[PDB]
């Protein structure tokens with residue numbers, strides 16, 4: 684058989700999901716590389732050539748990729764497909780992007796089942812010669828995602844309802860927090876060049892003090908300094924780096940979509956746990 688069906692995605696979470704559905708019969712490549720900021724990414728000549736060479740382009744939609752529309756004007760005769768059809772959007776409530784959908788829908792495992800379904804449909808339509816391989820790989824991979832729900836829930840189970848505050852830098856965890864009963868606090872609603880972050884840093888400092896929230900987090904594609912400022916001024920621990928916008932590289936700590944969900948939930952649970960330094964009181 685000749686060269687495989689080539690799929691190009693806008694960022695790495697879609698790439699890894701799509702690659703599991705594709706298995707060995709298609710090659711899935713990501714426009715943005717691990718670690719790169721994906722909201723205001725600036726496409727390069729490599730990105731255009733890679734997209735022009737694909738047989739299918741997958742993107743998130745929900746205004747995640749602010750660059751995609753201009754980028755896509757420069758690609759001729761490549762079909763695109765949004766992978767979030769059927770997602771129920773949560774709105775951004777503050778800032779210059781109030782009213783636009785919060786696009787980080789993949790942070791909910793049960794939304795991943797909708798991503799998988801939409802990717803599977805797109806692949807079967809545009810490469811029907813391998814339809815049965817996509818359908819079987821999509822089914823098998825949905826079962827892996829469904830098996831995550833019960834252990835993720837167990838991992839968070841000793842944080843009582845009123846202590847479940849998720850304090851992060853980007854408000855990128857709203858779909859995860861909704862599924863698992865967390866109240867979200869963020870330093871900015873969504874990545875962008877924007878006013879109001881120093882103000883919000885001080886608003887969040889007050890919320891942590893009033894509710895005795897023990898931990899705050901940052902994310903892997905943005906600067907950890909505002910979160911460290913919050914930790915310094917409140918006494919809350921800096922709980923480390925959460926992954927939402929990007930996987931790591933293939934040899935780093937978060938190589939797959941499932942690992943991103945597990946590491947993020949585990950890092951959250953470790954931030955609330957009492958297993959630090961201990962004395963005999």
Ligand SMILES: [Fe+3]
Nearest residue numbers: 853855874928
């Ligand atoms: Fe984001």
